[model samples]
Target: IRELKVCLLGDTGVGKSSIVCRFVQDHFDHNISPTIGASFMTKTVPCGNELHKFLIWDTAGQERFHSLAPMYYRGSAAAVIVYDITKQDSFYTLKKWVKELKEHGPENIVMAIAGNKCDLSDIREVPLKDAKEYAESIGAIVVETSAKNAINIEELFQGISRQIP
Candidate 1:
């Protein structure tokens, strides 16, 4: 599944780079080209006997970043909306992104909410229960991931992939 496109939406400081480290770096292939409006990368994941290639597009997650977001996710297969558990503002921004995404629309885009920075659970603000509740209300899959520790990172992507099948 080469066209299994996905979009990562999160605040600038939130775990976007950290998440990228988990899948990119060593294999920065020359085949993939960079995107202008948002960040882009790819990783092939194995699910059962099938291998799926994920084309990821990342948004800035800053003020007015949404201006170019629609252009990125318009042709995506999944939307991974990430937020830092330690920052309430990031979660609020995540909600704003969700609202904007729904307003414009992406039919059958497997929605996933990643509550990143679970490694810093000691300083948590966005409660896991609250995140799950909000995701449930919107029919999105939610998972807690620690990009620093690689905790549940595969499970998060697996969960997103599983949601589709």
Candidate 2:
């Protein structure tokens, strides 16, 4: 079995914790703020013939911890970049995070994208075409998800499970 460390990246809002909560515990709460220290969870998914342990971390919560990218990004095996399609700023933050991941994260580390809150697509600001285009360029799998209503949360992890070697 392989133990893969996956760091979740996103802006302050846009339901970062909610996504993890939905996927890990199959539960979602309204406006769950980030903890003082950090947030993380473990979910094991089958890769090919073997099962792998995915240790996911919400890496940027603390004021002091936000700048400490070397601690989290250095050895992570995969990255899950999240953004709310309604908030364009959230998507903007993702662009910087992606560059940061490239600058510091492992060259071989896999990438997965979350264009979250598909249920709110009625007011969608981040176009699906643009989202899919970016992911296609970088080879990151984009799964539009809904943390509030619980949709594609499992497929988000499963997509990366197949991505990891």
Candidate 3:
């Protein structure tokens, strides 16, 4: 199987770890523990006729761990930058993550911005159009997902898989 390194970055409580759990194990915990430093998980999915194993690094979102994120994602083949759709501030915070990836991440890295918590769309503050435009500006795809409900979770990974070589 071909190996692809994928990293997750986002603000605290935005469900980065949850997304990893949902994809890697097809399970989601309501009280998932916060990730310290970074956590590693892998899942193999078929891409065309080849099976590609995703070596995922789920990074912590706390400000204290921000400085060390580069260490985990420096050589990643793909990145899933997440944001809480219900929080407007998280949307703005995503810009910094995008900037960091552009400056230090691998030049060939494929990126995707996930407006997470779509299950709570009633409280969403970030408009899909705006997020899509911002993602487009940075050459990344925008997807809305909810790990708790398994909404778009598959599509999110499929989008990244299609982008990867």
Candidate 4:
């Protein structure tokens, strides 16, 4: 079976796991477990003619996991870098994630910048202009997502699917 390997990256509490849970298993958790070291799971998504099994690595966003980034990222075909729209610090960390991916991920890796918790637009700390522009500057596809609402979840994965050979 053909498979796609993807990495989930972001600052702590940006809802990375929430998104993963929602998409992979149709599950949602308001009280989340802090991802330690890293977590891994797989799900098969129907694309058009075939099932694309995504071997997803949901890595910890904590500083202690920085050293393991390379090992987790090496063969990834794509990566979703998430940040909470309500947190400025999380948005600002995009640069670091981008740099790390460039250094450790495959040269042809498909990258996307996902502004999660976008449903909380009232508390938005990062402007769309800034987020989209920065994402473009890094050659990334940018999209707003709300895992709670299941918004853009399919688009997020489908976008990567289309990008990969």
Candidate 5:
């Protein structure tokens, strides 16, 4: 088994912890509290005939924790840059995270952009085509997910697993 370090990055209230819980425990909490610093979860799953263990670090998305993000993502094998689909600002914030990763993160890191809160599709502010294009420009795949509704939660992790060695 191989252990892969993965980090979740996004603006506050974007459902980073919810995604982790959905993928790891198959549970969703409507009243999930905001993460203070970071939360950790370990999940082992099969990917292409091999079992991989993921050390998932769900980081705090508040502005106060922005300075400490590098510590969580420094050597991560994969990074999920998350944004709330209903908030245009969250999408804008993701660009900063992507820039940080390109400038300072690992050279071979596998990156993915997540348009979270897809369950609220009716209120989506980030257009799927625009997000997908931006992701392509940065060499990352874009996934629309809804942790609350358990949409694409497993596929998100599985997609990352396939990207890992």
Candidate 6:
């Protein structure tokens, strides 16, 4: 078994916890409790001849939890910075997250940008093209996913697999 740690970072209410549950468990539960500090979970997927176990940390996205970021991300092998496609602020925060990852996270950490809540097109505020381009600028592979519709959940995990060493 190949173990890997990945942290999910984003602004509050951007679906960080939702994405974690949806991708790992393949179901959506709106009644799920919000992540207080850090909610950890694991899911294994086949990668080549080995099984890759992703030990994921879905941390609090509120500004108050910023100080505890180091504790969760310190030894992470990779990270997925999540953002809500329906929120411009969340989209903009992705850049800041990438910058912090470069400055504070492990040098060799693999990073990706995940745009969650793609199923809510009615509330969509961030332009897909803009999000995609911005992610490219930060060297992040962009994935627009929907935890509700189960869209791109597995594919996003597969994309991360190819990026990690």
Give the top-scoring candidate (lDDT).
5
What lDDT does candidate 4 reach at residue 159? Answer: 82
- Tens-place lDDT digits, model 4, residues 29-147: 78988999888888888777777899989999988987887887789988999999999999878778999889878988999888999899999999989988998788889889999
Residue 149 shift from truth in candidate 3, angstroms: 0.6
Look at candidate 4 and give me any clashing residue pairs.
none
Q: What is the TM-score of each candidate against the true structure?
A: 0.87, 0.92, 0.97, 0.94, 0.97, 0.94
Error of 4 at 112 (Å): 1.1
Error of 1 at 76 (Å): 0.8
Tens digits of per-residue lDDT, candidate 5, 1-165, equal: 888999999999999999999999989999998999899999999888788899999999989999899999999999999999999999999999999999999999999888999999899899999999998998998899999989988888888887765
Ranking by TM-score: 5, 3, 6, 4, 2, 1
**Candidate 6 — worst ten consecutive residues by lDDT sum?**
131-140
Candidate 6's C-alpha lDDT?
0.85
Candidate with better lDDT, 2 vs 3: 3
Arranged by lDDT with the best first, the candidates are 5, 3, 4, 6, 2, 1
Q: Would you list the C-alpha lDDT of every candidate in the order shown?
A: 0.78, 0.83, 0.91, 0.87, 0.92, 0.85
Q: How does model 3 fare in lDDT?
A: 0.91
For candidate 2, give the lDDT: 0.83
Candidate 4: count of backbone clashes, pairs at least 3 residues apart or interchain = 0
Across 1-165, the per-residue lDDT of candidate 6 in tens digits comes to 889888998998888888889878877887876678889999999987778999999999988899999888889988888889888888778778888889999988877778898888899998889988887776778889888888887877787788865
RMSD of 1: 4.4
Which segments of candidate 3 are over 4 A away from where they belong? none
- Give the clashing residue pairs of candidate 1, or none: none
Better of 1 and 3 by TM-score: 3
